[PDB]
């Protein structure tokens, strides 16, 4: 009855405990998979948490009739976020009866999803007048949940959490956790610095970046340096060694022995992938 | 910790009562109050939630209950009018922020309406 | 809390020249010993910049935030107490607060009810041989607060320069700064400084007008000696020169004068002797004329569309429409149709074209 | 401009009827007629069409009818022979002009026929 | 009341109206007049119902 809306933003939405914890009996998201949550960014989230009857949890899912969905909490069929529910009889059960958790019982009409009607003025079931505060056909619209430690299956208090959020109408400020990998130099690696793509070899640099500068570019406006985002340091980027391969050969009717020239390639990178060697001479035109 | 509760007592019909709910802290301008009552031998039902600066009351407490808050001293006063014997209940007052956190449980005071 | 300080001397907003100030780093890309041209919202070279005082005279008018604003405050004996941002400034929409102090700074973003005279109070010499601060009146209440982090202090005749550039792109509020001593020269100093960025704010709202905030009963009062500069930025290409250290030691406005245009085309600061082709010349139109035949009879779209008898599909009714003024707006705006598709034209532009011959095929 | 269909009286099985579809127009000879059939509450169907040079009937009325033209009157007429009680329908008649596609649909005539 | 054309020898050219009620030669072996399970009527009716 008294669900409250929370503003969640400017943070990171890692579920490393939320999904890997067994305390939630149903990690259900109707728009995304549990795996895709950490790999995707999101927008402002209106988290909704409440405890309802165990046999009425079907009314939490959209497109369902009943007193709960009609009177206190309705959801739309296009819901995208996550609904998390489990059993919390111990957490929210009272020895005398946990009747604080209340569900609305009567309304003039069925409401719409995401509506807060705290106004509860006189309601009449029939056409007979209902003046003052009491009278015939003036039935109370609120009933307490039967939350007791002796409740059976489907009758114990079940905590339900709804991570309802809307997208495509606000700037994206919340993303999933961002991973890091052990840094390696002097090797041709597929680097990824703050989302930057490309392949190259990392190398400690003599360049002195300014504190706010995170990228280095030459006259051709292509990246050649990058500031390390964890341990601030500037690393040169050099394209992995390449060049044409030329086969020095005499005539076939003279001999079938050939020599191979790796144009513009130092002899060190030749055996990376005639890589055995046994004949090496590094000229100015290649190996 | 807890919420301090007062204003309860045993009174006859037609009297005046003023329940009090005070929540300690430093953010009273953002606090929201939800009320409840629990009759002896009967169900515990919601009374009146005063959130932000909005007020509302249920069927049996509309007009009879005049909810109010004191921003100066973090006090909530509920004027009680038109006493009815069936409303004898223990009132639990709740205090929370706009998020719904900072949940403290009120002990509840003994309120009784005597029949005639 | 807010007090209307209505006492001020009638001074019109003076102007002055912004010689070579307002250049920041347009991007976080290191460049070494190279000259680079990038076009963004910069402060024009040798532009006229608004002149404000604080004397007696308390200049604090609402000013628009059209596409970036340059703020410089040659204000010794610090009394500048932040800025106002937003579009409404009456608690209906989200608004931005920036403040300052000796060792603290707060960036406050809420739907704020701003009074017509928002200022921070400063009492004077309370027998404690020092000035203390209290009684700040910038808003009334905090209604919808979202973004409220606390940074570290940035507080460093007049001897301090506090040139700040505020830009809001894609909802990201950018702040640039640079502090350097000033030796006389009451106007903007004759020197080139680059404003390194300070913060980036994911506000995501629209800012259309701003306001400055200064320190400080109310009627018949004198403002402390202050002077701050307000210039407006427009999109103009530049040519920024980076040294070995990577700092912008000089820049050229690509559209200032023909020499600057030639420097911009040659991508160099020094220009050899000769003739250089530059951007082309043209005369822009001065007024737009429209000439249509003055036929007054409205086209028979009424019975073309709302005809009760629509024939079969193999007997599609072809009606001739000509020699009339056809108003397609009434058809387009009326959403009673489930499919209003145009292929060779656009439905919105139909009210500007005069057609040779129109066929109507109703079925 | 319009078409009216009159006729379809009460007759006996095997009898002959004369139904005329007089048309308000001036070139109805070009507007060749098509006869349509609808059962009393069931799906619709066609009957015949004297499209100028030749004719075309339906499976139920195959050759049993003698379709006629009244070109000097710009009216059409169908001759009904070997009528059956299972042909209790509401015959129609329609013509669409070659130029500026348009319909001149009529109203209908009962084809009630007794059985004994 | 709304009839449509279904049988024709080929695709009609753009903006062409075909109202010919003559029987289409649907079957491989031509049949003339009326119809059987062949040379069916080129007009069918929309069953427009609320
Ligand atoms: C990000 O975290 C890493 C690890 O906590 C920081 O690296 C440490 O930095 C301190 C300060 O120089 C060193 O004493 C440690 O030896 C570093 N540890 C490792 C594992 O590298 C790093 O400084 C943090 N990022 C920033 C910008 O401070
Ligand atoms: C000095 O100024 C700072 C802000 O730059 C003050 O700190 C904040 O002041 C606002 C004003 O309402 C409060 O809402 C914040 O809670 C304050 N934050 C902190 C961390 O203090 C600071 O109070 C000022 N100092 C004095 C002595 O007034
Ligand atoms: C780039 O910055 C560095 C450091 O601020 C400057 O190098 C120092 O300059 C001072 C002043 O001449 C010398 O006393 C130091 O010995 C220099 N240190 C080093 C390590 O060189 C440098 O001059 C700056 N370069 C430019 C072009 O501004
Ligand atoms: C969602 C989540 O993190 N839940 C955990 C809970 O499983 C654990 O028992 C508790 C211990 O303090 O901390 C919290
Ligand atoms: C009446 C008055 O001005 N009182 C001020 C007080 O507000 C301020 O906090 C203090 C500073 O130490 O100086 C005194
Ligand atoms: C954050 C913001 O102001 N967004 C507005 C949006 O509300 C408005 O609908 C649109 C034009 O209609 O322009 C933009
Ligand atoms: C190579 O020499 C042989 C000798 O028998 C000759 O037949 C052949 O044509 C020669 N090939 C070329 C390409 O000259
Ligand atoms: C700035 O405005 C003043 C207004 O009088 C004008 O005189 C001056 O020429 C302007 N500056 C430039 C560079 O045009
Ligand atoms: C045609 O009908 C629609 C809806 O019935 C109406 O909105 C429109 O105005 C009509 N056309 C004219 C020309 O009035």
Author numbering:
A (entry chain C): 351 to 623, 636 to 649
B (entry chain F), D (entry chain D): 2 to 117
C (entry chain A): 14 to 68, 77 to 177, 185 to 244, 254 to 400
E (entry chain A): 450 to 499
Sentences from the paper on this structure:
Nanobodies are small, stable, customizable, and inexpensive to produce. Herein, we present a panel of nanobodies that can detect the spike proteins of five SARS-CoV-2 variants of concern (VOCs) including Omicron. Here we show via ELISA, lateral flow, kinetic, flow cytometric, microscopy, and Western blotting assays that our nanobodies can quantify the spike variants. This panel of nanobodies broadly neutralizes viral infection caused by pseudotyped and authentic SARS-CoV-2 VOCs. P86 potently neutralized the SARS-CoV-2 Omicron variants compared to clinically available therapeutic antibodies.
To determine the epitopes of the P86 and P17 clones on the SARS-CoV-2 spike, we performed a single-particle analysis of the spike-P86 and spike-P17 complexes using cryo-electron microscopy (cryo-EM). We observed 2-RBD-up (2-up+P86; 46.2%) and 3-RBD-up (3-up+P86; 53.8%) from the spike-P86 complex and 1-RBD-up (1-up+P17) and 2-RBD-up (2-up+P17) from the spike-P17 complex. After manual model modifications, the P86 monomer fit well into the final sharpened map. The edge of the CDR3 region was inserted into the cleft between the down-RBD and the NTD of the neighbouring protomer, forming many hydrophilic and hydrophobic interactions. The epitope of P86 was located outside of Class-2 and Class-3 and was on the opposite side of Class-1 and Class-4. We superposed them on the single down-RBD within the 2-up+P86 model, which clearly showed P86—especially the CDR1 and CDR3 loops—uniquely bound the down-RBD and the NTD of the neighbouring protomer. We noticed that the P86-bound down-RBD interfered with the ACE2 in its access to the neighbouring up-RBD. The L452R variant may substantially reduce the avidity of P86 to the RBD: R452 is located near the centre of the P86 binding interface. We assume that the Class-2 antibodies can only bind a solid state of the hook containing E484, whereas P86 is not severely influenced by states of the hook region containing K484 because P86 also contacts the conserved cleft between the RBD and the NTD of the neighbouring protomer.
